[PDB]
Design a protein around this motif. Structure first.
Motif, PDB file in Angstrom:
ATOM      1  N   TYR A 138       0.808  -1.226   0.000  1.00 32.14           N
ATOM      2  CA  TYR A 138       0.000   0.000   0.000  1.00 32.14           C
ATOM      3  C   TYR A 138       0.844   1.280   0.000  1.00 32.14           C
ATOM      4  O   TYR A 138       0.304   2.374  -0.165  1.00 32.14           O
ATOM      5  CB  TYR A 138      -0.967   0.021   1.194  1.00 32.14           C
ATOM      6  N   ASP A 139       2.157   1.147   0.178  1.00 32.28           N
ATOM      7  CA  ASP A 139       3.077   2.290   0.075  1.00 32.28           C
ATOM      8  C   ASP A 139       3.250   2.803  -1.368  1.00 32.28           C
ATOM      9  O   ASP A 139       3.939   3.801  -1.598  1.00 32.28           O
ATOM     10  CB  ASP A 139       4.448   1.952   0.686  1.00 32.28           C
ATOM     11  N   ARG A 140       2.634   2.111  -2.328  1.00 35.13           N
ATOM     12  CA  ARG A 140       2.625   2.539  -3.727  1.00 35.13           C
ATOM     13  C   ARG A 140       1.295   3.184  -4.137  1.00 35.13           C
ATOM     14  O   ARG A 140       1.160   3.672  -5.261  1.00 35.13           O
ATOM     15  CB  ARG A 140       2.918   1.344  -4.638  1.00 35.13           C
ATOM     16  N   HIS A 141       0.324   3.186  -3.224  1.00 33.01           N
ATOM     17  CA  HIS A 141      -1.028   3.677  -3.507  1.00 33.01           C
ATOM     18  C   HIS A 141      -1.234   5.105  -3.004  1.00 33.01           C
ATOM     19  O   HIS A 141      -1.897   5.908  -3.660  1.00 33.01           O
ATOM     20  CB  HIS A 141      -2.066   2.754  -2.866  1.00 33.01           C
ATOM     21  N   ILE A 142      -0.678   5.406  -1.833  1.00 31.54           N
ATOM     22  CA  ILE A 142      -0.732   6.754  -1.257  1.00 31.54           C
ATOM     23  C   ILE A 142       0.674   7.340  -1.159  1.00 31.54           C
ATOM     24  O   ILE A 142       1.663   6.636  -1.381  1.00 31.54           O
ATOM     25  CB  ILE A 142      -1.415   6.766   0.131  1.00 31.54           C
ATOM     26  N   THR A 143       0.758   8.629  -0.834  1.00 33.91           N
ATOM     27  CA  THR A 143       2.044   9.324  -0.761  1.00 33.91           C
ATOM     28  C   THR A 143       2.721   9.149   0.601  1.00 33.91           C
ATOM     29  O   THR A 143       2.785  10.083   1.408  1.00 33.91           O
ATOM     30  CB  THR A 143       1.903  10.825  -1.088  1.00 33.91           C
ATOM     31  N   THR A 194      -0.262  -5.378  -7.712  1.00 31.04           N
ATOM     32  CA  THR A 194      -1.202  -4.375  -8.301  1.00 31.04           C
ATOM     33  C   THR A 194      -2.187  -3.866  -7.231  1.00 31.04           C
ATOM     34  O   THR A 194      -1.759  -3.482  -6.141  1.00 31.04           O
ATOM     35  CB  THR A 194      -1.931  -4.943  -9.544  1.00 31.04           C
ATOM     36  N   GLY A 195      -3.487  -3.868  -7.531  1.00 38.09           N
ATOM     37  CA  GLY A 195      -4.491  -3.254  -6.660  1.00 38.09           C
ATOM     38  C   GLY A 195      -4.699  -1.769  -6.931  1.00 38.09           C
ATOM     39  O   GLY A 195      -5.436  -1.101  -6.204  1.00 38.09           O
ATOM     40  N   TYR A 196      -4.068  -1.258  -7.988  1.00 33.06           N
ATOM     41  CA  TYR A 196      -4.132   0.167  -8.334  1.00 33.06           C
ATOM     42  C   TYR A 196      -5.527   0.619  -8.786  1.00 33.06           C
ATOM     43  O   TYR A 196      -5.834   1.813  -8.759  1.00 33.06           O
ATOM     44  CB  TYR A 196      -3.116   0.495  -9.435  1.00 33.06           C
ATOM     45  N   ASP A 197      -6.358  -0.333  -9.204  1.00 34.23           N
ATOM     46  CA  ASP A 197      -7.711  -0.045  -9.693  1.00 34.23           C
ATOM     47  C   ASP A 197      -8.796  -0.117  -8.607  1.00 34.23           C
ATOM     48  O   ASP A 197      -9.969   0.145  -8.885  1.00 34.23           O
ATOM     49  CB  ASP A 197      -8.069  -1.007 -10.834  1.00 34.23           C
ATOM     50  N   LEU A 198      -8.408  -0.470  -7.385  1.00 37.26           N
ATOM     51  CA  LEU A 198      -9.363  -0.635  -6.286  1.00 37.26           C
ATOM     52  C   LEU A 198      -9.762   0.688  -5.634  1.00 37.26           C
ATOM     53  O   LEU A 198     -10.787   0.760  -4.955  1.00 37.26           O
ATOM     54  CB  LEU A 198      -8.785  -1.569  -5.218  1.00 37.26           C
ATOM     55  N   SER A 199      -8.955   1.727  -5.837  1.00 34.35           N
ATOM     56  CA  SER A 199      -9.172   3.019  -5.190  1.00 34.35           C
ATOM     57  C   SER A 199      -9.150   4.157  -6.210  1.00 34.35           C
ATOM     58  O   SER A 199      -8.336   4.157  -7.137  1.00 34.35           O
ATOM     59  CB  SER A 199      -8.099   3.245  -4.122  1.00 34.35           C
ATOM     60  N   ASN A 200     -10.056   5.116  -6.036  1.00 34.25           N
ATOM     61  CA  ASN A 200     -10.109   6.296  -6.895  1.00 34.25           C
ATOM     62  C   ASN A 200      -9.006   7.281  -6.517  1.00 34.25           C
ATOM     63  O   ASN A 200      -8.650   7.400  -5.347  1.00 34.25           O
ATOM     64  CB  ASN A 200     -11.481   6.972  -6.788  1.00 34.25           C
ATOM     65  N   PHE A 231      -7.374   4.181 -13.087  1.00 32.20           N
ATOM     66  CA  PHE A 231      -8.215   3.082 -13.585  1.00 32.20           C
ATOM     67  C   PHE A 231      -9.693   3.221 -13.217  1.00 32.20           C
ATOM     68  O   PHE A 231     -10.566   2.815 -13.981  1.00 32.20           O
ATOM     69  CB  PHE A 231      -7.683   1.727 -13.102  1.00 32.20           C
ATOM     70  N   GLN A 232      -9.966   3.794 -12.049  1.00 35.70           N
ATOM     71  CA  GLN A 232     -11.342   4.016 -11.598  1.00 35.70           C
ATOM     72  C   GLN A 232     -12.149   4.913 -12.539  1.00 35.70           C
ATOM     73  O   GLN A 232     -13.351   4.709 -12.711  1.00 35.70           O
ATOM     74  CB  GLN A 232     -11.349   4.600 -10.183  1.00 35.70           C
ATOM     75  N   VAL A 233     -11.490   5.902 -13.136  1.00 42.64           N
ATOM     76  CA  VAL A 233     -12.124   6.776 -14.126  1.00 42.64           C
ATOM     77  C   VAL A 233     -12.397   6.008 -15.419  1.00 42.64           C
ATOM     78  O   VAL A 233     -13.456   6.159 -16.022  1.00 42.64           O
ATOM     79  CB  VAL A 233     -11.253   8.015 -14.428  1.00 42.64           C
ATOM     80  N   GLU A 234     -11.435   5.190 -15.836  1.00 39.86           N
ATOM     81  CA  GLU A 234     -11.591   4.348 -17.025  1.00 39.86           C
ATOM     82  C   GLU A 234     -12.703   3.316 -16.844  1.00 39.86           C
ATOM     83  O   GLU A 234     -13.363   2.928 -17.808  1.00 39.86           O
ATOM     84  CB  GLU A 234     -10.276   3.643 -17.358  1.00 39.86           C
ATOM     85  N   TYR A 235     -12.894   2.874 -15.605  1.00 39.99           N
ATOM     86  CA  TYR A 235     -13.983   1.961 -15.257  1.00 39.99           C
ATOM     87  C   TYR A 235     -15.335   2.669 -15.313  1.00 39.99           C
ATOM     88  O   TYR A 235     -16.342   2.061 -15.672  1.00 39.99           O
ATOM     89  CB  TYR A 235     -13.758   1.375 -13.858  1.00 39.99           C
ATOM     90  N   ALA A 236     -15.355   3.950 -14.949  1.00 43.76           N
ATOM     91  CA  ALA A 236     -16.564   4.768 -15.068  1.00 43.76           C
ATOM     92  C   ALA A 236     -16.946   4.976 -16.533  1.00 43.76           C
ATOM     93  O   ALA A 236     -18.128   5.051 -16.861  1.00 43.76           O
ATOM     94  CB  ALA A 236     -16.372   6.109 -14.376  1.00 43.76           C
TER      95      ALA A 236
END
Ligand SMILES: [Cl-]
Ligand SMILES: [Mg+2]
Lengths: 231, 244, 195, 240, 235, 250, 111, 241, 243
Positions: free
Chosen positions: H2-7, I1-7, I17-22
């Motif tokens: 999760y350190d790649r998802h937020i800053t 990954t998991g980059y598409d799970l959160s806006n 990815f969330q915008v592309e899913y919209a």
């Protein structure tokens, strides 16, 4: 799957699963029917009980002298939304001395349900509603879904096995639409419609719930011995 | 939403322990050892600086020992930055009490309030606890000389002699061995230094790797004096006891 | 409300407080006790605006009692007086200030000395050998300037107090229906029943 | 503000955070309450891995909430201070509005309500503390003993124990305590309390605290020698 | 983890469904409604013999005309009762009349769903709300943490609920007397209870128009227990 | 909407480490070398001006910053984090000191305020720690000259001389050999330039080196005359020309 | 200075019989020495066989009647169409009026 | 991870969200260039209108922040416009509070400080844009200052941004090695625009029509963008030499 | 990954990815178009007749903002309504302060900034609609199309929904064959044809045509719905062209 944790998340195909799961709660709910002519609008609702010792869950709620709905799904959510409608109908009366148009009533419910589908923390409403009313442009029938989608119809039905009543009304469209100036006949058509959604159980005296509004009829609900006429 | 990234700092383990408190104590166990010894006529505070560099300015430095008011001092073990937040609060709390009652704050009351603040960070707010353990050394006219300790859990206790930080297990066994109740300050000074000298991870204990302080009634008649030892004074006391 | 006196002698503090509660042209009560025990060796008399007086006295009483339970220890009369002063000092710059004047008589057990503090509604504190609030002072201060000695006994202090009450009964316009007298010493607080 | 719902239901219908708070209570030192015919006695274990302590200044295990009611506990020590403080404030607030000190039932009900609030409030964890609350109602000579726990439930007990090895001492009290005839005197009640702790404690030296509460705000804590006499007397009768 | 107000794929709120499991673990509570009154009875279930059973308060007064019995995490009920009592008294202040039993129940059920991310979780307790008013007469309501309430002629909640509910199905008729209902609650409680039923581990109460809501004494319940045993042996 | 991150992003791991602080220190390690040396009559702080592009004007980017007239700061690590810290540090010197006492804060206390800001980023909700280590040199009447280091944790230590960043380990060893308690300011500037040449790779001149001193008062840099007690700032940034002069006699 | 109150005059009268009750009121509305309306009713049917009049300052009077009428409507919604008894209506009106104790409705009310 | 998802920091002291925001910069596949004259500052950017249904006049990545300041963006248009509106508001407020026009470099710093906040605060994401501010500052003269998602900013003699930025950068570097000066030694802005286009043509290796380019020019007391015909007139001048 | 799970989370590409899913939700919706003309704009939309029970002409999808702007959208209908509600608030506050009705480019950015704001945080979801809108202001006619990302441009013609590619192809022909311009009345007829042609990509259920328009000459610069004779004339024109 991974995209159903909350309402704020889209799926890769562009679906909102929490909204779809809320929609599922309606399908589990007891059947209710709505239909109208040009003079009157009628709600018919099959009530459900926990067991033989229990009462039958009340499905129909009054919003104003000229408007009201029937519910299918989470009853507390219907209470919240019906209460909101009561206030909006009442605001229109006190401020503008104006009966709230049934179309605007739908627009307001749509916008209230929508806000719950775009924000974190909250959840969608878990109930479907059938709103009937008589206003300055005659009789009306609306179908509310907690996705936000509101639809004006001649007739419809929601709940478990609602497809039976919905098909019947689709066939009977040309007949019941012209039942003008005759309440008892429009109800009969509605009672016959909801009968197409029955399995093993039949319509009894403390099971059936009917409501009506029209040109010279305030929104009034009939339960108990008052519906024995229509069985 | 943000739930995904929440560590949940203020929860119980299945065993009934507070994860973050336990891990903060683990952090403190690597910090330089601090010792407090209470005598009948005063209190000693001794603390070992964390691996010193020869170019560190020693005389104008404060890492371990801090002054809360004229009658109360603390020895620190853990994150210095965290300790300074709590020290400024404790300094303010002491002045509030003086302003309200026109009397210097009783030691336990100050200790309790600081400990209550730590407790709050373990029960609510979702923030990490303070990675700090204190040794409070102070005097008031009710209980006289008092030693206390508090830790990240917000739990505090009173002591005759106590250590915090690194090698407390070994240090506490040595104090428990040589301590007695009729002890004087100058004896307690010697015990404190001897204990550090044996428990130290360093090769040899020197003046530049120590902070030292005493709270005596060694002023003139019925009044307390705080002495934060200067570098040269630590050098002399280290020679006087025959460690160097 | 109206008359509250205080006299510190050798070994005790004596507080006299009028019994009358008047509203309009009617004396509603003639046995009113205008005092509260803050702690076993600390007594506070009060006088001022109706309602404010008792509300303030009981609020202070609750706070001192709370402290006593928390620390299992009695606050010194000096400490209690400083707390009370600060509460009034806050009050005066509030939206609606407490209009209450107080006398705090206490026996410090650590010093073995009686102590009398006079605090007005502004938060103006002074330690005194004798004190009074309201119009009473205009008679009693000069009287006590003459007759008071610092080494007097409790019995001598009561006779000195009788001399004040007699003067007030003679020259004061209003009927204050006598006084309730209370003594604060090493053994605590007790009330004189025949005055 | 930190909002997270920390105390929540699990599939099997348990609130784990509340149940894990009970584990903290189970870890805590043993505490026992026994009520006699005209008194209540609160006994408390003190672990002996801590020598070089200063017992003058160390927080006592039994706390006075008012002059007539006391509170002992088992579990997290830091947590207990927060409950004790709140209870003490409510005690003075009750005297101020009702012009009468709290009943032991009312004080217990308040403390239990605080504990419950922390089980369904956002951003907070439950108290890792169970309490024994004992005393006498104003102008009443009937002894009162109550228990609370993290969940928020509370109830009255003729005798009860909490903390580590409490199930052992509860076993002892269940056969040794007669409902028809409670300890008639102070001595009998203290002895039964000391006996029950001696099943679990270790040594009867500076490990046992005893506090006796009698009617009309008559509360006193026993000293080492006074307690040691009970320990000496019990052991001599045991060798039989 | 996951949101507190999250829907399952079947269209149910996870937390509400889990709280229902907590209620199944709770002690049994039974209610029966007649034309002579509504009876409420509960299993006390003391965890230890040293616990003074008369301090176990699982039947509770809301107003003179409304009573309440509980089952599940009973500590959660305190704030629900407090709200109910205030609602009842407040309505009397505003309208100079007794409040309807249904209206009271509806007001309590409005709290139920006021949880999320308001309180942190649903209530872990179910309530049987029994009462009388001039309009709808003697009424019994089952209030759940879902925010839903059903009126019942008779109802059982708690651990022995499904077994007791099946028994109530057979036994209830619209011409039951109050005395018949009292015995029926005692009979069904004795069946589903673990320990043997007596006056100390079970409690009876009723609400009548004339005398209002009354919790029975242990002496009064004991005679009804003795009357029950004799009647079962008599055939 | 709204900041829902009201919880700590820096927490204790089982081993007792504060991960984000450790990682912030790693970011400092990657940063360009900066150093500070304390003399008897002054302090020098210096660093390399790592240019991002030759088209970029490195004069516009100031790594060494004035905080008060008698206090200066330099860093190693993330430039943006440093920039905002300088803004906050300049402001706190006024709000929490000058507007109260009518004079600038002593070095140790300003340092203490900056440390507080960095400590809060280690514990407050929804924030990471600052990715910089500061070296703050300054003078005040009652403490004389001083030099402090401030780490991402919020901890600060006083130094006779030290270095931080890329080649700090080698630079600190170099300074230990050269430093004595009798160093004059010019001797400290000389050593600073020697120490810095070891870590710098490319060009080494007044345009690629940034260097400032805390020394004597500068009445010419005050901007006004007429008040005897006001004698001018002790902080002075050495010019590109002034550095090159000393590089010839190196 | 702005004066938020005015006097719209008129008068009202209520009498109770054995199985009936009357509430009368004149239809004149005035300000100062001018007639505003010769027919402006101020006695209203509020439902549930309750008639009401709030005479004095008409703006406050109309506001109160409007609020009570609305109170009757919500009493039905919240309590299963129960009839609001005259004694209950009276108590409800007390709370409406006293709600503005420190900025009163300038009206003498009769139901 | 999760350190790649937020800053927040990664174990190696990196902010991956900031690094990925940099990659969003080139999502439009457009190259920009900025140079300084004696009296002026010229910025040019490629204009690519792929869809025939688009109104080409509304397709723009150059913005007029204030009367004096101009800004070109490299990145997606939503974030570009987000940054533009904020810059406009900041420049307007600055004038109102402090009684003089906001300098180009001060605005750059302010926008950079805002960008820094998104790298430290978790709930805010960085904007996937690189902002190039241009003006003729009344104190500093012709000015080019550039901001990125990291919160970094610096002044430039000249600069380029985009996918083929490096080719343009070295092309300009080699010219300033040759000319031995910090700017384009030219009197009129017309010829500085001609220089900018000429050197972009050489670096990218492509020819441009009037609709393939977008030009912004900053002079003393005003910044303005050129029309298609203004660029066409400019292209004709280059061709006839 | 998991980059598409959160806006608001950037993927390693630099994508949200969330915008592309919209956008996928928008592609799923019914077809809607916009045609710019000589002195105004024309909007049209496909309304799928799910059942005989739907009341004709009484489930209106095109919405008006202020009195001079028209908005139509494809995708999640409630999301579109939320956006228009905001648009109306924005247009009201503009008129309140500046007196003049909000210009179309000004209005376009107001929606753009609002939609873009819903890509900045993980506590909100992106909009599940592409919105075609426009009208007439002091500078003449303007047509715009706004997407989930917050991206918008001016258009000669615009199309979105399930039949967007069919509609785009048909729009491109009109732009080529009419360089001088298309008239308002012509654009209404063409709009009908293009919806009918775009209906081939959604031909299971039959549909109901809905058209609106703003024109300086025909509607006096105000937004009006096309009804009655003019609507039936446009339907007949479309019917003739498919056969
Ligand atoms: Cl800033
Ligand atoms: Mg005074």
């Amino acid at each position: 799957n991974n995209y159903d944790g909350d309402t704020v998340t889209f799926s890769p195909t562009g679906r909102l699963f929490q909204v779809e799961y809320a929609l599922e709660a309606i399908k589990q709910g007891s059947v209710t029917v709505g239909l109208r002519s040009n003079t009157h609008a009628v709600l018919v609702a099959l009530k459900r009980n926990a067991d033989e010792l229990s009462s039958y869950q009340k499905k129909i709620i009054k919003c104003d002298e000229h408007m009201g709905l029937s519910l299918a799904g989470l009853a507390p959510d219907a209470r919240v939304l019906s209460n909101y409608l009561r206030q909006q109908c009442n605001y229109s009366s006190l401020v503008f001395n104006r009966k709230l148009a049934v179309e605007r009533a739908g627009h307001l419910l749509c916008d209230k349900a929508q806000k719950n589908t775009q924000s974190y923390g909250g959840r969608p409403y878990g109930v479907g509603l059938l709103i009937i009313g008589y206003d300055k442009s005659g009789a009306h029938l609306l179908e509310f879904q907690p996705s936000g989608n509101v639809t004006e119809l001649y007739g419809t039905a929601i709940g478990a096995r609602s497809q039976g009543a919905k098909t019947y009304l689709e066939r009977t469209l040309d007949t019941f639409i012209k039942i003008d100036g005759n309440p008892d006949e429009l109800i009969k058509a509605g009672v016959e419609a909801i009968s197409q959604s029955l399995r093993d159980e039949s319509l009894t005296v403390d099971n059936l719930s009917i409501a009506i509004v029209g040109k010279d009829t305030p929104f009034t609900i009939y339960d108990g011995e008052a519906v024995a006429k229509y069985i | 939403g943000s739930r995904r990234y929440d560590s949940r700092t203020t929860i119980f383990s299945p065993e009934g322990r507070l994860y973050q408190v336990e891990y903060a104590l683990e952090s403190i166990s690597h910090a330089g050892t601090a010792i407090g010894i209470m005598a009948s006529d005063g209190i000693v505070l001794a603390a070992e600086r964390k691996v010193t560099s020869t170019l560190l300015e020693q005389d104008t430095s404060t890492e371990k020992l801090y002054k809360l008011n004229d009658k109360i001092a603390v020895a620190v073990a853990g994150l210095t930055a965290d300790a300074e937040i709590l020290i400024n609060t404790a300094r303010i709390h002491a002045q509030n009490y003086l302003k309200t009652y026109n009397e210097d704050i009783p030691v336990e009351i100050l200790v309790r309030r600081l400990s209550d603040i730590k407790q709050g960070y373990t029960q609510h707010g979702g923030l990490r606890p303070f990675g700090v353990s204190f040794i409070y050394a102070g005097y008031d006219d009710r209980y006289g000389y008092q030693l206390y300790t508090s830790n990240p859990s917000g739990n505090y206790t009173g002591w005759k002699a106590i250590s915090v930080g690194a090698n407390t297990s070994a240090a506490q066994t040595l104090l428990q061995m040589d301590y007695k109740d009729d002890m004087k300050v100058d004896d307690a000074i010697e015990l404190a230094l001897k204990t550090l000298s044996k428990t130290t991870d360093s090769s040899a204990l020197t003046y530049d790797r120590l902070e030292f302080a005493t709270i005596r009634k060694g002023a003139n008649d019925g009044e307390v004096y705080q002495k934060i030892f200067k570098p040269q004074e630590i050098k002399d006391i280290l020679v006087k006891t025959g460690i160097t | 409300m109206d008359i509250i006196l205080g006299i510190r002698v050798q070994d005790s503090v004596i507080l006299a407080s009028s019994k009358a509660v008047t509203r309009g042209i009617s004396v509603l009560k003639d046995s009113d006790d205008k005092t509260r025990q803050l702690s076993p060796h600390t007594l506070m008399s009060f006088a001022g605006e109706a309602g404010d007086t008792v509300q303030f006295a009981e609020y202070i009483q609750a706070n001192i009692q709370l402290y006593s339970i928390r620390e299992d220890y009695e606050l010194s009369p000096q400490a209690v007086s400083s707390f009370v002063r600060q509460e009034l000092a806050k009050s005066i710059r509030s939206r609606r200030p407490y209009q209450v004047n107080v006398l705090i008589g206490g026996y410090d057990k650590k010093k073995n000395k009686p102590e009398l503090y006079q605090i007005d509604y502004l938060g103006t504190k002074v330690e005194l050998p004798y004190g009074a609030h309201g119009y009473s002072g205009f008679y009693t201060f000069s009287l006590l300037d003459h007759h008071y000695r610092p080494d007097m006994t409790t019995e001598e202090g009561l006779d000195l107090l009788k001399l004040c009450v007699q003067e007030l009964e003679k020259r004061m316009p209003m009927d204050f229906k006598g006084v309730i007298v209370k003594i604060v010493d090493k053994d605590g607080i007790r009330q004189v029943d025949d005055f | 503000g930190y909002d997270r719902a920390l105390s929540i239901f699990s599939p099997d219908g348990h609130i784990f955070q509340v149940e894990y708070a009970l584990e903290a209570v189970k870890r805590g030192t043993c505490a026992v309450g026994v009520k006699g015919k005209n008194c209540v006695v609160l006994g408390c274990e003190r672990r002996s891995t801590l020598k070089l302590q200063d017992t003058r200044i160390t927080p006592s295990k039994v706390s006075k909430i008012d002059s007539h009611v006391v509170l002992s506990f088992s579990g997290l020590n830091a947590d207990s201070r927060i409950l004790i403080e709140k209870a003490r404030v409510e005690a003075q607030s009750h005297r101020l509005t009702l012009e009468d000190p709290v009943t032991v039932e009312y004080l217990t009900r308040y403390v239990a309500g605080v504990q419950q609030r922390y089980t369904q409030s956002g951003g907070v964890r439950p108290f890792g503390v169970s309490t024994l609350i004992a005393g006498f109602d104003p102008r009443d000579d009937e002894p009162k003993l109550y228990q609370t726990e993290p969940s928020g439930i509370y109830s009255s007990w003729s005798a009860q124990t909490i903390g580590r090895n409490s199930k052992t001492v509860r076993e002892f009290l269940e056969k040794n305590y007669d409902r028809k005839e409670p300890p008639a005197t102070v001595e009998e009640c203290v002895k039964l309390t000391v006996r029950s702790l001696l099943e679990v404690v270790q040594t009867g030296a500076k490990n046992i605290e005893i506090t006796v509460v009698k009617p009309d705000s008559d509360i006193v804590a026993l000293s080492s020698e006074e307690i040691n006499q009970y320990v000496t007397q019990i052991e001599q009768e045991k060798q039989e | 983890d996951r949101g507190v107000s999250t829907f399952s794929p079947e269209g149910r709120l996870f937390q509400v469904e889990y709280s229902l499991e907590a209620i199944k673990l709770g002690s049994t509570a039974i209610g029966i409604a007649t034309k002579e009154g509504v009876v409420l009875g509960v299993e006390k279930r003391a965890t230890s013999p040293l616990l003074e059973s008369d301090s176990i308060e699982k039947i509770v007064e809301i107003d003179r005309h409304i009573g309440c019995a509980m089952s599940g995490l009973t500590a959660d009920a305190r704030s629900m009762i407090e709200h109910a009592r205030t609602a009842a008294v407040t309505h009397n202040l505003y309208y100079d009349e007794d409040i309807n039993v249904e209206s009271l129940t509806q007001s309590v059920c409005d709290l139920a769903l006021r949880f999320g991310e308001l309180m942190s979780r649903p209530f872990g307790v179910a309530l049987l709300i029994a009462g009388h008013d001039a309009d709808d007469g003697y009424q019994l309501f089952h209030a759940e943490p879902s925010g839903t309430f059903y009126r019942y002629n008779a109802k059982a909640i708690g651990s022995g609920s499904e077994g007791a509910q099946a028994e109530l199905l057979n036994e209830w008729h619209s011409s039951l007397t109050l005395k018949e209902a009292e015995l029926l609650v005692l009979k069904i409680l004795k069946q589903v209870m673990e320990e043997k039923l007596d006056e100390n581990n079970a409690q009876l109460s009723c609400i009548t128009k004339q005398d209002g809501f009354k919790i029975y004494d242990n002496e009064k319940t004991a005679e009804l227990i003795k009357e029950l045993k004799e009647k079962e042996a008599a055939e | 909407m709204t900041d829902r991150y009201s919880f700590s992003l820096t927490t204790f791991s089982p081993s007792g480490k504060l991960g984000q602080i450790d990682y912030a220190l790693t970011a400092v390690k990657q940063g360009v070398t900066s150093l500070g040396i304390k003399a008897t009559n002054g302090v020098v702080i210096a660093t390399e001006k790592k240019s991002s592009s030759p088209l970029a004007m490195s004069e516009t980017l100031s790594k060494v910053s004035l905080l008060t007239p008698d206090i200066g700061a330099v860093y190693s690590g993330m430039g943006p984090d440093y920039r905002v810290l300088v803004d906050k540090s300049r402001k706190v010197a006024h709000t929490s000191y000058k507007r109260i006492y009518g004079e600038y804060p002593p070095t140790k206390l300003l340092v203490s305020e900056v440390a507080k800001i960095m400590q809060e980023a280690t514990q407050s909700g929804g924030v990471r720690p600052f990715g910089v280590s500061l070296l703050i040199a300054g003078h005040d009447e009652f403490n004389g000259f001083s030099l402090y280091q401030v780490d991402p944790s919020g901890s600060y230590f006083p130094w006779k001389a030290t270095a931080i960043g890329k080649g700090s380990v080698a630079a600190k060893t170099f300074l230990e050999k050269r430093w004595n308690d009798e160093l004059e300011l010019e001797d400290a500037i000389h050593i600073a330039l020697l120490t810095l040449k070891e870590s710098v790779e490319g060009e080494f001149n007044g345009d690629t080196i940034e260097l400032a001193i805390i020394g004597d008062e500068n009445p010419d840099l005050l901007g006004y005359t007429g008040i005897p007690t006001d004698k001018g700032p002790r902080f002075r940034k050495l010019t590109s020309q002034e550095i090159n002069d000393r590089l010839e006699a190196l | 200075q702005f004066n938020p109150y005015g006097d719209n005059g008129g008068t009202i009268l209520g009498i109770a019989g054995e199985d009936f009750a009357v509430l009368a009121g004149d239809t004149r509305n005035i300000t100062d020495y001018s007639i505003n309306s010769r027919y402006e009713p101020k006695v209203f049917d509020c439902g549930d066989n309750i008639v009401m009049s709030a005479n004095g300052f008409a703006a406050d009077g109309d506001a109160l009647v409007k609020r009570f009428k609305n109170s009757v409507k919500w009493y039905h919604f919240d309590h299963n169409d129960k009839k609001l008894s005259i004694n209950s209506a009276a108590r409800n009106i007390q709370h409406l009026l006293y709600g503005k104790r420190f900025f009163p409705y300038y009206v003498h009310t009769i139901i | 991870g999760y350190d790649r998802h937020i800053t927040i920091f990664s174990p190696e002291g990196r902010l991956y969200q900031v690094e990925y925001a940099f990659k969003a910069t080139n999502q439009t596949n457009i190259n920009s260039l900025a140079v300084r004259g004696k009296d002026c500052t010229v910025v040019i950017s490629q204009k690519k209108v792929p869809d025939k249904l688009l109104d080409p006049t509304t397709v723009s990545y150059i913005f007029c922040i204030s009367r004096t300041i101009g800004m070109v963006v490299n990145g997606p248009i939503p974030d570009a416009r987000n940054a533009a509106l904020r810059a406009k508001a900041e420049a307007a407020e600055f004038r109102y509070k402090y009684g003089y026009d906001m300098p180009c470099d001060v605005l750059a710093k302010r926008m950079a400080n805002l960008s820094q906040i998104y790298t430290q605060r978790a709930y805010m994401r960085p904007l996937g844009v690189i902002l190039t501010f241009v003006s003729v500052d009344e104190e500093l003269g012709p000015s080019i200052y550039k901001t990125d998602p990291a919160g970094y900013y610096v002044g430039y003699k000249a600069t380029a941004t985009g996918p083929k930025q490096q080719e343009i950068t070295t092309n300009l570097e080699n010219h300033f090695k040759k000319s031995k000066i910090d700017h384009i030694n030219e009197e009129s802005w017309e010829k500085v625009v001609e220089f900018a286009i000429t050197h972009m043509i050489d670096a990218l290796g492509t020819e441009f029509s009037k609709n393939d380019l977008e030009v912004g020019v900053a002079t003393k007391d005003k910044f303005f963008t050129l029309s298609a015909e203004n660029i066409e007139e400019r292209l004709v001048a280059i061709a006839e030499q | 990954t998991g980059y598409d799970l959160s806006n608001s989370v950037f993927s390693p590409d630099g994508r949200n990815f969330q915008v592309e899913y919209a956008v996928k939700a928008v592609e799923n919706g019914t077809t809607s178009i916009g045609i710019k003309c000589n002195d105004g704009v024309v909007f049209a939309v496909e309304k799928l007749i799910t059942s005989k029970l739907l009341v004709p002409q009484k489930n209106v999808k095109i919405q008006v903002v202020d009195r001079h702007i028209g908005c139509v959208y494809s995708g999640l209908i409630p999301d579109g309504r939320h956006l228009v509600n905001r648009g109306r608030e924005e247009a009201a506050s503009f008129k309140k302060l500046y007196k003049t009705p909000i210009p179309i480019p000004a209005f376009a950015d107001r929606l753009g900034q609002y939609v873009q704001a819903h890509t900045l945080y993980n506590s909100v979801r992106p909009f599940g609609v592409s919105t075609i809108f426009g009208g007439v202001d002091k500078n003449g006619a303007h047509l715009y199309m706004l997407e989930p990302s917050g991206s918008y441009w001016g258009y000669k013609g615009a199309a979105t929904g399930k039949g967007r590619q069919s509609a785009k192809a048909e729009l491109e022909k009109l732009v080529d064959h009419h360089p001088e311009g298309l008239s308002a009345r012509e654009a209404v007829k063409q709009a009908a044809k293009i919806i009918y042609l775009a209906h081939e990509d959604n031909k299971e259920k039959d549909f109901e045509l809905e058209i609106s328009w703003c024109s300086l000459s025909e509607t006096n610069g105000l937004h009006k719905f096309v009804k009655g004779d003019l609507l039936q004339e446009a339907i007949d024109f479309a019917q003739k062209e498919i056969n």
